[PDB]
């Protein structure tokens, strides 16, 4: 979901137990990680809401974005609703729970269909994080000789 | 995203510096136009609906082709669309006005928007000219002097689509 | 900021900022006076806050600056009153900014990642922020001391 | 309000599935109420039966 | 409510409240007592109110009573004028709260299909909550009219 | 969660009806001790590490075959997760403090804690003894008022375990 | 990813042959260091946190630049970053190592590494000081034999950086 | 093969090779010249195992060869013998790999699929594979031909 | 899931003892039986197609009315999750027979199936004749050694469904 | 165990196990015998193994010891030995096991977070873990003392 | 059925049905009087159609009932035909619901598994149900016979 490991001081205690004592499931673990704080500041903040979108199916669907009905549904829910309902739509959705089900942690996949799906998710599934992970105190070319 | 206390934060903290009397006199700039910021912030949200009506119907008076057969905005789905990026332009302003810069407007909504207008068919100069209209109309309910302060913020908007 | 915080929560939502937001960011920008005054005071005092706490931590751990210590050395002994001056620094970008955030992202976020690369004790750094603590609070008024001690806790607590 | 406890059996009816998939069949799960209604839909529409329905807190 | 708001956030994170959360807290319970005097002084005028903001509303837009309209009748104007009761409690409520969260969850989540169930028309509404809204205003001090403007006008914005 | 403003909200509308003067009183009432919950919330705060470790040494020193093997916190994973709760405890506590109510407390830890901890194994009765020495730590720290407001929901805690 | 193993398959395989004896001898070859490159990929697992020391130690003694204010070492955010990338590379490079191949490195590492760290604005480098520097300290630990062969994934690094 | 398998199983958890995976590896490398020679003395008799193979796959199942077969005719038996010899390859690729990944991703991943494209029946695979067994055990040693057996046992279950 | 050496390890760790005398024999009495569990299980996995179709065969001879109309076996649909729950309990029978311990038998089948066949309609009574026909298959399948240790593995399933 | 992970891999994969992990299991039990004696070795002489690492770990770090030391006093040592046996357990637990599970699941998860809360530095740790791993490793033959190291090593990193 | 796909797909978007759902239902029912009739001139057809087909299948594939046939035997020729009745049977009810998800929910999810379980060539299957399909088709009408013919073919592909 964070497409990286993640430090201990970062990790979401709460719903780890919840995980751990069986009371919710691995789909509801997901949840919970993608409606973190940390989820927004790295994944929506950053972003216009289009590219929102496209992380959003990558991290929760293993996936880009099939068709231009996808980007129209969730720019939609993303500009009247938030990211909560659009998390909540990608997680409800009929192609998780056949990919994932209940208890599957999300990967990476390169659908053979629709047309231009598999070369979009090896873009999608092969692009690192681009964007400074902090707004304070940027970085700079430039050097000093000694 | 930034804000204006984050710029300067930003200014003194890549050279390693104290806060300086520019710097001061800097937030003391913010801090007092921050009253007015929150009254003009607090006047759009009470009127976006409003501010969204008037705004495209200057724009569909001006440019009556674009919601006639052939437009782009001709259809109930692509005009409800129009609206939607209308409604994104007034919310990231106000977001703008209130934090006192524009990296998220640049950060939120010019990154890669006129790629996305390129691909979509999106006639761009209708867009700027859908945002000046908003600017006409904000100004008029916010009051002249935060009539500026979202005229910096919209004239952003419109430099960087246009 | 206070601002930045509410303005990012009003966008995960795809709304406006809600009364109680408003007047939140009210309330912060009436306040900014306050706020650049013990900014400025703990400005003019960087260098007696820097003094005196290296010295209270130096007197309380005379190994560190003993043979064999990490903070041994003229040389290194400057990276160590370096240090306290960055965290000063950063929190008097904290009484600015309303919060603990330009902190956290510059100076907590990873912390102990670099500390342990370096070799430097997390309980040294712990108790030199107690004493730049007692030192900056000390030149304060005790309303200004209060809010000062507030950012000095989460950086002592966060480093700890 | 808030949250519900919910057991329901949700069968297979368009393949027969190689893994295990015990615990997607029958599962017990804590569902908060602004979801419900949409899980409770889901689990209907999916040919899946709901066993038990539970009010944990509120 | 402010508080409830600030824990929520700090709960979500799993961590204690900020200094900038408390600090929030603090102008809250600061403003108690004007809250309080804003909150009374409108439940003690609530039915001057109601009727003036009622009979500005019809003059404004007579559609309503009209033979045809939605508060055709007695019947319907006097449920017309209960509906402005509710709202003017619910805004009473958000002013004690320092938030529009009981407003949201009593009179905003889902009045939208209520009042298309009733055929009720929305900018009527807005209409009716403006007029309420400078009725309120009209007998209140300037500050406090402003602390109750925000309010009616977050209901306004959420009906439209 | 509902704070003691939100809970006379919602009584009173319930009712169907305004606000009141003992309504206006209870929420005068929480006003006043607003002060004086912020700042044993930002010293609890400022010191749970500290209080954590005190408790916990307490309460392993007084029932030393906890940690010890065959002990419900005999592994560094159980006394790991020994340690987690107390810190939950804790800030759980500090928040309904905060918010004047004990529901927090309620629909957030206690729910399901009893049937948790008995089909675990957890001892309910030592649970309550770190809560209690927790109680006394915090209670120490904060000062006597703070320490009367706090002991509510520590003994809420420890109650609604048994 | 390929090992040497998998390498002389897929050379024999594309040609649809059973194995020869040049494919024999290159496989007694892979077998005969098997020891060696386990001894060595043990000697980094157990060092890995010493090596980054020294690695990071000589990176930002060579260039104080990176973690000036406004470096791109230049926060403990980034600062920890910089050495959980030198963990990468050391990691990835074992990996190699153990395989007897760069299959793994091209594939998992450098692929787009060039262009992501354009758009971080990291230093390309000085990020190939930091590999080489991490090479020399590793090789001293490892032996000259298991040295010899660990530079030639350290350099791919290097070069695919390049 | 056992390297790969290892390696990827460690990348997969974002760690390095545990002391187990290692001593599986140390094993494998040691073993390395013993299964060399097994690959090298099936590969010196493939004539041979490919001639016999077929001939018992042909006489257990005569509808194979005759007329409305797959096989029948004699292009299509050789087709037939030179998919066995594919089969052996794959074995002795398996063989120097340690495991059975060479024989699972470029003989057994949609197999069904090509051989139902091709009217093949998976049950004629499965004895034709089974007397390769028979044959390429023969020539080995007890211990060579149950490791051996192992890989054409996965052969014969994957194409079943 | 548990193994052998894993209960053991665990026997002595909440004693906080050593190994001695004892677990030395038993772990001895694992590693002695080791390398005829792993050709039981190569033997299994190699003929585990052969197992399902001669164990389906005879419970759907002894007990035709299964797959006729009306039996619970009737449908393609329900006779190919007949045969696939017959899979399931051979394969994990096969690992719990390598792990020397029935754990996974109860975590990863046991948990939840009778209530599932229940719900489902599924007859427990003919599910274990399937299983006992599996065992009697795959009995004179390993050989008389391994028949024993794979029969006890099936007998705790058939006793988990009944 | 070794078991456990090659059973816990194949029924991710919902098959049975491969050539490569029969193969693998088979190469475990195998050397039962060896890791046997190896564990009965280390903790037939445990008690000398304890008292010695201590002694290296102690003169070492004697500020451990020392007046402000975490292990200063009689009761204090007395828990640094019965920490240093405790992991000396797990290594043989971990040896005949196969694999450093136990020793993850015992020691490892939440160890720092332990020690955090006990005020126990790290690196003590860590030098205490390689303190018991050379005496450990002095017992045994270099054949054995190989195997040994590495967990020892792992150990050591984990906690590290 | 037509109705039971047609719902399923309303309800899938929350809807009533379309014009196009509801004509749909409309020509199907419309049409039922002319279903019935050819399901039943497919019911008492039994013996004819069932012995036709299996003559066929058998003359064309000999194998079947040669011996080492799966058909071979007088048990399991009667297997054979019962088999050939169940699809004639799902034939009819495809036909009254007017798709084929009767054929499909009875018999064509996991027929390939059963069928394999029951070592029967899936081949054999797709000649059978031509020949059911000749043998249908022959004894109906032109317009008749094409609808029933495309029943047939569905299911052929369904197990080819
Ligand atoms: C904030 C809401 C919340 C609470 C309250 C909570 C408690 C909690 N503690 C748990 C386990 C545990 N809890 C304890 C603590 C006990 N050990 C004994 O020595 C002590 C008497 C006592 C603590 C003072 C231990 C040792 C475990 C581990 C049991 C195991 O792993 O088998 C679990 C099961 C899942 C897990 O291990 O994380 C929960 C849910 N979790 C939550 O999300
Ligand atoms: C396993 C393959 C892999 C690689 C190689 C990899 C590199 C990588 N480094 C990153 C950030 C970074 N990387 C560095 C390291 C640089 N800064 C210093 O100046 C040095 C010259 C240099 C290291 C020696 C820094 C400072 C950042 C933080 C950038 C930022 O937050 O703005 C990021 C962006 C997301 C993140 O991890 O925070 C990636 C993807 N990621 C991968 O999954
Ligand atoms: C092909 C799909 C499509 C539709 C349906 C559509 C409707 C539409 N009607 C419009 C104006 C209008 N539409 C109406 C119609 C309303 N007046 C009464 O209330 C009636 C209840 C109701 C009609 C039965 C009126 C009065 C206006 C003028 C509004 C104005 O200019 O202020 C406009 C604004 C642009 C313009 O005036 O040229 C649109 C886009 N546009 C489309 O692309
Ligand atoms: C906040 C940053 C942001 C913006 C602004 C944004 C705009 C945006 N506008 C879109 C479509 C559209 N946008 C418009 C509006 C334009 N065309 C009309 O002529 C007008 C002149 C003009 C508006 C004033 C229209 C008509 C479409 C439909 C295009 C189509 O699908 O054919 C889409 C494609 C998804 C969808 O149709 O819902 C996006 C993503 N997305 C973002 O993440
Ligand atoms: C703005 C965020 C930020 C911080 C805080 C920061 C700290 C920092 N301190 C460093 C060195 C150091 N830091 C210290 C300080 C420690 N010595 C004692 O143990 C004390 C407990 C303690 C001081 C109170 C010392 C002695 C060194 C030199 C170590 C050496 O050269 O071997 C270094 C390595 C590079 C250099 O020499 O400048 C960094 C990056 N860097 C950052 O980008
Ligand atoms: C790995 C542990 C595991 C087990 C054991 C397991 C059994 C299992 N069998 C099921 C259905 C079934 N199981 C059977 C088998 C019965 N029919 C005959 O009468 C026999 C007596 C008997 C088998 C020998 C049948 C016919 C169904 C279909 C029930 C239906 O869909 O109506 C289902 C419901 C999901 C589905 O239909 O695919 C499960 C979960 N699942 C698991 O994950
Ligand atoms: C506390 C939150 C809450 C609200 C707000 C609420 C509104 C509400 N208004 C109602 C009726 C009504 N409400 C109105 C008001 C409309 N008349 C004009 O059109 C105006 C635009 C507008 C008011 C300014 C009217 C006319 C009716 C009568 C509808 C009828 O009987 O047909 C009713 C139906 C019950 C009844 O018969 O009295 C409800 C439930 N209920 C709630 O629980
Ligand atoms: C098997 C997994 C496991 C471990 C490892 C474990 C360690 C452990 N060590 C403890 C005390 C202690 N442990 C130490 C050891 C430290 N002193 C020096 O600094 C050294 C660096 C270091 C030892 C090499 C000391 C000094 C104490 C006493 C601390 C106190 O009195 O508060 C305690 C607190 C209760 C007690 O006294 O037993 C635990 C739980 N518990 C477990 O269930
Ligand atoms: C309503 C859906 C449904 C179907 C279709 C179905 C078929 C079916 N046929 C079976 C037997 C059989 N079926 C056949 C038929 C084959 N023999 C030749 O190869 C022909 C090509 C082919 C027939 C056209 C034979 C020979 C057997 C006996 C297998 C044996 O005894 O080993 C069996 C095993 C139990 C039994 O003996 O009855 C099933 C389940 N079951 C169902 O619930």
Redesign the pocket.
């Known amino acids: 979901v964070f497409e990286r490991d993640v430090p201990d001081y970062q990790r979401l205690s709460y719903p780890e137990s919840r995980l751990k004592n069986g009371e919710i499931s691995m789909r509801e673990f997901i949840r919970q990680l993608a409606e973190s704080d940390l989820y927004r500041k790295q994944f929506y903040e950053p972003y216009?809401?289009?590219k929102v979108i496209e992380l959003l199916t990558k991290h929760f669907l293993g996936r880009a974005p099939q068709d231009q009905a996808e980007?129209?549904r969730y720019?939609?829910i993303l500009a009247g609703k938030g990211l909560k309902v659009a998390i909540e739509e990608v997680l409800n959705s009929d192609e998780y729970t056949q990919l994932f089900g209940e208890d599957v942690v999300p990967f990476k996949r390169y659908p053979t269909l629709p047309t231009g799906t598999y070369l979009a998710s090896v873009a999608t599934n092969d692009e690192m994080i681009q964007q400074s992970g902090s707004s304070y105190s940027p970085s700079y070319a430039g050097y000093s000789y000694p | 995203m930034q804000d204006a206390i984050t710029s300067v934060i930003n200014t003194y903290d890549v050279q390693g510096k104290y806060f300086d009397t520019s710097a001061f006199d800097k937030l003391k700039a913010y801090y007092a136009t921050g009253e007015l910021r929150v009254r003009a912030a607090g006047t759009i949200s009470a009127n976006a609906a409003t501010i969204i009506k008037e705004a495209s119907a200057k724009?569909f008076s001006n440019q009556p082709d674009?919601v006639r057969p052939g437009?782009?905005?001709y259809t109930t789905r692509?005009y409800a669309?129009?609206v939607?990026?209308?409604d994104?332009?007034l919310r990231?302003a106000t977001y703008a006005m209130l934090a006192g810069d524009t990296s998220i407007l640049d950060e939120?909504?010019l990154n890669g928007?006129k790629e996305?207008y390129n691909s979509?068919?999106?006639?761009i100069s209708?867009?700027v000219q859908?945002i000046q209209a908003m600017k006409e109309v904000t100004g008029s309910l916010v009051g002249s002097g935060a009539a500026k302060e979202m005229g910096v913020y919209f004239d952003y908007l419109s430099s960087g689509l246009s | 900021s206070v601002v930045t915080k509410a303005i990012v929560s009003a966008d995960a939502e795809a709304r406006y900022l809600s009364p109680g937001e408003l007047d939140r960011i009210r309330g912060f920008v009436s306040s900014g006076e306050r706020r650049l005054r013990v900014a400025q005071t703990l400005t003019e005092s960087r260098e007696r806050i820097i003094k005196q706490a290296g010295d209270q931590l130096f007197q309380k751990r005379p190994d560190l600056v003993s043979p064999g210590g990490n903070a041994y050395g003229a040389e290194r002994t400057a990276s160590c009153l370096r240090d306290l001056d960055y965290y000063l620094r950063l929190v008097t970008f904290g009484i600015v900014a309303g919060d603990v955030t330009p902190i956290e992202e510059i100076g907590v976020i990873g912390v102990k990642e670099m500390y342990r690369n370096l070799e430097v004790p997390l309980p040294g750094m712990v108790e030199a922020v107690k004493a730049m603590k007692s030192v900056a609070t000390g030149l304060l008024s005790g309303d200004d001391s209060a809010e000062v001690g507030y950012y000095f806790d989460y950086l002592a607590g966060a480093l700890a | 309000t808030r949250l519900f406890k919910v057991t329901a059996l949700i069968p297979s009816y368009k393949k027969v599935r190689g893994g295990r998939e015990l615990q997607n069949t029958y599962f017990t799960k804590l569902v908060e109420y602004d979801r419900w209604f949409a899980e409770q839909q889901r689990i209907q529409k999916q040919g899946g039966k709901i066993l038990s329905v539970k009010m944990v807190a509120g």
């Not at chain 2, 979509?120 to 006639?123: A, D, E, N, R, S």
């Open positions: 216009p809401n289009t980007i129209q720019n939609r | 724009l674009l437009g782009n905005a692509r669309a129009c939607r990026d209308m994104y332009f990231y939120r909504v928007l996305t979509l068919g999106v006639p209708s867009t859908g």
